[PDB]
Amino acid sequence: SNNWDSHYGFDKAGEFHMLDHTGFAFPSEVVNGRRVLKTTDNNCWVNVTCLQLQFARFRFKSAGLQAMWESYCTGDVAMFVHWLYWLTGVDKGQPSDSENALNMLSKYIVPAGSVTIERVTHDGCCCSKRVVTAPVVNASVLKLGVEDGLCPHGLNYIDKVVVVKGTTIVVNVGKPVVAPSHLFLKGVSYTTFLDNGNGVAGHYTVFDHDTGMVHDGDVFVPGDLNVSPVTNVVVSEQTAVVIKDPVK
Numbered sequence: 001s002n003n004w005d006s007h008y009g010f011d012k013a014g015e016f017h018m019l020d021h022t023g024f025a026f027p028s029e030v031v032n033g034r035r036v037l038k039t040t041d042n043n044c045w046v047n048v049t050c051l052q053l054q055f056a057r058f059r060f061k062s063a064g065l066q067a068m069w070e071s072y073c074t075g076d077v078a079m080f081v082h083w084l085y086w087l088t089g090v091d092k093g094q095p096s097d098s099e100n101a102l103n104m105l106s107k108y109i110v111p112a113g114s115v116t117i118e119r120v121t122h123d124g125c126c127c128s129k130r131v132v133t134a135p136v137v138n139a140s141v142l143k144l145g146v147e148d149g150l151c152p153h154g155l156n157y158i159d160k161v162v163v164v165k166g167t168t169i170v171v172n173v174g175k176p177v178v179a180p181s182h183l184f185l186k187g188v189s190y191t192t193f194l195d196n197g198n199g200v201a202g203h204y205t206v207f208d209h210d211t212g213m214v215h216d217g218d219v220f221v222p223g224d225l226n227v228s229p230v231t232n233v234v235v236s237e238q239t240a241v242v243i244k245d246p247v248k
C-alpha cells in the first residue's frame, strides 16, 4: 500500500488521498484578513472551526495537513473542508459541533502554548494544579471557572484557568454561556452559538475582540458579546516574528 500516512499524518490517509474533494469547494472570501465561508448547507460549524484555527495562528505537524490548511487560507478550500467532514464523519448539508471538531483536531496541531488549570477551594484548604499543553483545552471560559464537587472539608472545588502561556483554544465545559464580556477569559476571538429561530439549528459565529464585530459566514456584522452564548475562546499572547525551520 502506498505510504501516505507519514505525509499526511493521520490514519487512513491513503483512502482520503484519492477522493474527489470538489463537492466541498464552498464559496469563500477574505473578511478583516480572515478566510471565511459563505453560509450554506449548514456549514457554519466549519466556518467557525477554521476561523479559530486562524485566530490561534496554529500550524499542523504534517506536511500534507499543513499544505491543505495553507491552501484553505489562500482560498483553495475544498480539500481541507472535505477532510473535516471525512474526519468527523459528518454528512455534507448537516449541522455539526465545532468544539467536537476542534477537540479532534488537537492531536494534529503543533503545540503552541501551556495552560495552567487550578482546582481550589475558597479558603485554600485544598489546592491542585495541572498544566495542559494540548492546543485545544477543555475548561471554563469564565475567569471564575466552574464548581467541581466537594473537598473533604466540605467546600466546593473551583476549577479555573489561571495561566495561559502562548496560544490555546479553551473549549467551554457545559452549555454555551452568557456573561458580561469582562468576566470571560480575555481572548482575541469568541465562538458563539445563538438561537436562529424555529425550524433550524442554532447559528455559529465568531466575535472579533479588536473590532467588536462578528464573523457571520462571509460577512462582518455588529455584535454584542455580552448577550452571545460562548462555546470557545482563543487566548493568545502572540509572538512578534514568525519562526519557521529550513526544509531538510
Ligand SMILES: [Zn+2]
Pocket: 121, 125, 126, 151, 152, 153, 154, 155
Ligand atoms: Zn478542603
